[PDB]
Protein: Dihydroorotase
Amino acid sequence: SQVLKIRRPDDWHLHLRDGDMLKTVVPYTSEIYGRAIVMPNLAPPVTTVEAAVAYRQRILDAVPAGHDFTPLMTCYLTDSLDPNELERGFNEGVFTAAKLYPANGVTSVDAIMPVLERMEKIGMPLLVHGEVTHADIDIFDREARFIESVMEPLRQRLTALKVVFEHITTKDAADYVRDGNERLAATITPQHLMFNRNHMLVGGVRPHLYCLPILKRNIHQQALRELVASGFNRVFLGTDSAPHARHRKESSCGCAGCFNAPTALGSYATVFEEMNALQHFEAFCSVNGPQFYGLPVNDTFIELVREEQQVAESIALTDDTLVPFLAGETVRWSVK
Amino acid sequence: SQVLKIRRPDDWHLHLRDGDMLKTVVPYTSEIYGRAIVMPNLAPPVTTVEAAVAYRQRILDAVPAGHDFTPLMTCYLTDSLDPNELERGFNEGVFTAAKLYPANATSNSSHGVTSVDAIMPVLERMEKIGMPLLVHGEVTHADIDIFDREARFIESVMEPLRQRLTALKVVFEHITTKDAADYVRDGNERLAATITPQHLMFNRNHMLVGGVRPHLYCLPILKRNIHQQALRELVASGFNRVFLGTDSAPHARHRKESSCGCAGCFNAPTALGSYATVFEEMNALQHFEAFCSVNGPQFYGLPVNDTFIELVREEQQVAESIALTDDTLVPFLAGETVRWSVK
Ligand SMILES: NC(=O)N[C@@H](CC(=O)O)C(=O)O
Ligand SMILES: O=C1C[C@@H](C(=O)O)NC(=O)N1
Ligand SMILES: [Zn+2]
Ligand SMILES: [Zn+2]
Ligand SMILES: [Zn+2]
Ligand SMILES: [Zn+2]
Structure:
């Protein structure tokens, strides 16, 4: 019965893959979101303007006629990337931002200072997967350790640099972001709002809930839920929809990533509704991101209805299937 | 190449399953171990003397010609279990011990325990007759973080139980935490523990970094490195109320590598050499025989084995998988090169 009309959303953190997987997955995004930040971690990664232009065209080839969807491309930062290449792509409208992945990506921030300094000067946002990767650091501590040892030093060095702390998963990061300045923002996925590590590990191991940064303790989940529900205007929708074929997930060494594009928007609506915070929902989906990136808000509107839809058990691929996040379950809100 | 000769070991915590899976897995135990504690979590559970007798015989049927292997059977504790049934099984040599799995208010009375308070008549009987209680010590309340469940058990159940029943003999099965290590270390002669090879060799990072590894997924869940190190130090100290219990817990490959993978490591094929590797790395090989072959017997009041086996420090590759009638079994350390093997 209940209907919720919002400004059309965007997705500020998306993996579209390539090839036949890209053809399969893009329509789940393009049918809903006006734009999406398309991450650059292809094999090999998108590190040149030329590669980004080609990738962008493959994505557009795969967008059904009638979907008004614009992929916003990103550069994968590498220790050796030429700052002139990053800037050229930016000037051309090809690169919207650059993405910093930990080594096991970038080995040190120090190795890429010239690039980061260029980004700071030209006003290019830096998107950060914020985890340290030393073998001795427990996997649940890697996000927290990143804040102290990399993020805060980096932001102290480049005080004009705009940073998105991508897919934050901890109370540590939530507090860090809440207390930061207008040059620091974050994205949060649906899974890190809806679940905690118990949902991945109790009663069985659930690889479809296995993603990076790893699901944390409930106290962390609660901190993220309170953050979005507070109305804080520098957090915004980024799904980290990260699809893998079923048997790449269900194997002796399962790939990280949740394929949440089909269910994310309604999943977010449920969280906000639960937190008694639907008045902040549009801003999270459709306003906060644009503001941070200095892009206009979308000028169309969509509707969500609170009618329970059943999530497909699987989606066909050329070879194998794709298991969506919440496969076989129910979502309380769906797109009208 | 170096040789380690020990009295024939026993496995104080084992899952043998049933049917065809039992036929496949028993030889990996019977070739090496003189005795094993056979856990009772079949579907349906072993909760009667008659079922334990028939199960013991199915196990015996699957032992290869010439292996000298004796299964020591256990009773699954449930709300509806009659203390007279348990006592009779004990008195007749059928039940060596009884096994308490985590309580759950939704448990069918035929299949489990709703709360420990609700099975005090049976626990009092075990105390009275000197039957050892084997405890899977986790609390499973939905609002407890899975990594916290063992420590919460110590506080909520273990300590109060042992204060209530001061003569009760308890083995804290497959301990995984420094909490449990210290607790057991500081206990009396009526408290012991078993430790698996996976909890000595690995921590949760091994299960979750670079990929999710369901063949390392087991209960109680792998913990953070500080806990793994405490376990290692406990065994390496020569503490004589910790002993070998593999928790070898086989599931078909398709049941492990699924959207909801089953908990358990099939480590019977590789456990003993893994334990040897750990003791060696801890410079504690002088304590290795006792852990494998003496401490368990002393705790249970049974004789130490009088035959010997040899481990050799020569590298071998572990099978990638082991055929079942349908599907396959992936062993602990599948495909890896291991340092010690049985001669
Ligand atoms: N997060 C994930 O679990 N997966 C992402 C990578 C990423 O965002 O690190 C992927 O590309 O597979
Ligand atoms: O408690 C248990 C049960 C066992 C099994 O599979 O039977 N597997 C485990 O991982 N631990
Ligand atoms: Zn990431
Ligand atoms: Zn991502
Ligand atoms: Zn157990
Ligand atoms: Zn067990």
